[PDB]
Structure 1
Amino acid sequence: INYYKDAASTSSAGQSLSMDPSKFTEPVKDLMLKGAPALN
């Protein structure tokens, strides 16, 4: 129950439960498959 009118006044947000490290761990242009050779 929100007792207040504005959105800033609500409690903390709830877990992204998004999670996708590939923008950080695999930003390569041509896709690399694990097990296939790195450099062909």
Structure 2
Amino acid sequence: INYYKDAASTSSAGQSLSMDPSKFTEPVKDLMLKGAPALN
């Protein structure tokens, strides 16, 4: 329960469970599957 009206008072959001490390680990145009030759 909040005691104030404006959003500056609300508490933190906790944790963002929506993870997606692909944008940083595999920022490649063509799809690369584990095991298959990276270049062919």
**Scaled by the length of structure 2, what TM-score is found?**
0.88
Aligned pair count?
40
**Which structure 1 residue ranges, 5 or more long, are not aligned?**
none
Name the one with the larger helix percent: 1
**Alignment root-mean-square deviation, CA:** 0.7
What is the CA-CA distance between 1:10 and the residue it aligns to? 0.8
* Percentage of identical aligned residues: 100
**Which residue of 2 is the match for residue 2 of structure 1?**
2
Unaligned runs of 5+ in 2: none
Moved over 4 A (4+): none
